[PDB]
Amino acid sequence: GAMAPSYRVKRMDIAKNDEECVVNAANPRGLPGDGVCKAVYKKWPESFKNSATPVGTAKTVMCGTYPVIHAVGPNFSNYTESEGDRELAAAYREVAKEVTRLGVNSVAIPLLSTGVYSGGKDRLTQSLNHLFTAMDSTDADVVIYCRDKEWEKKISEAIQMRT
Ligand SMILES: [Cl-]
Ligand SMILES: [Cl-]
Numbered sequence: 001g002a003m004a005p006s007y008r009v010k011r012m013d014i015a016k017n018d019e020e021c022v023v024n025a026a027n028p029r030g031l032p033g034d035g036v037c038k039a040v041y042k043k044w045p046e047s048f049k050n051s052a053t054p055v056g057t058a059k060t061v062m063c064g065t066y067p068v069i070h071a072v073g074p075n076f077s078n079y080t081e082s083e084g085d086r087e088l089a090a091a092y093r094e095v096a097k098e099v100t101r102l103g104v105n106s107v108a109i110p111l112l113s114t115g116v117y118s119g120g121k122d123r124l125t126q127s128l129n130h131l132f133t134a135m136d137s138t139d140a141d142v143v144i145y146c147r148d149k150e151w152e153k154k155i156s157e158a159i160q161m162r163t
């Protein structure tokens with residue numbers, strides 16, 4: 001574990017992370033996709049061998065010895081708000097299990113279901129709170145990656161609020 005487990009946020013490409021493993025915002029079919037998923041495919045394409053997994057689950061595939069945790073958040077275009085919320089919470093609980101199993105001291109993680117899977121809604125707070133619920137009991141350093149300057153500020157404030 002980390003000596004003093006922390007949360008941090010960076011505004012940059014998760015494919016350039018400085019952590020011991022990465023969470024992919026995957027699709028259920030293990031396709032290259034777009035956004036975070038396409039950047040992950042370009043950086044770690046070997047990790048997409050048998051990466052297909054259902055909504056609400058996480059499946060780890062090694063690229064060399066570097067773990068890529070494929071986490072499948074719901075597409076809120078397809079799910080009801082209620083069912084989507086349940087699957088989004090579940091995807092993050094499965095990430096916590098994988099991070100624990102791997103024994104890493106740090107993990108790079110995007111906010112699941114906040115991009116093309118958001119169903120055109122702002123889900124920063126919803127997605128981040130489910131990330132916290134899952135990861136709070138783990139002792140890995142968590143580094144959240146985002147692309148928007150306003151999101152960086154909001155995520156940083158939410159981290160600092162808990163102290
Ligand atoms: Cl960048
Ligand atoms: Cl997304």
Ligand SMILES: [Cl-]
Nearest residue numbers: 146147148151
């Ligand atoms: Cl963002």
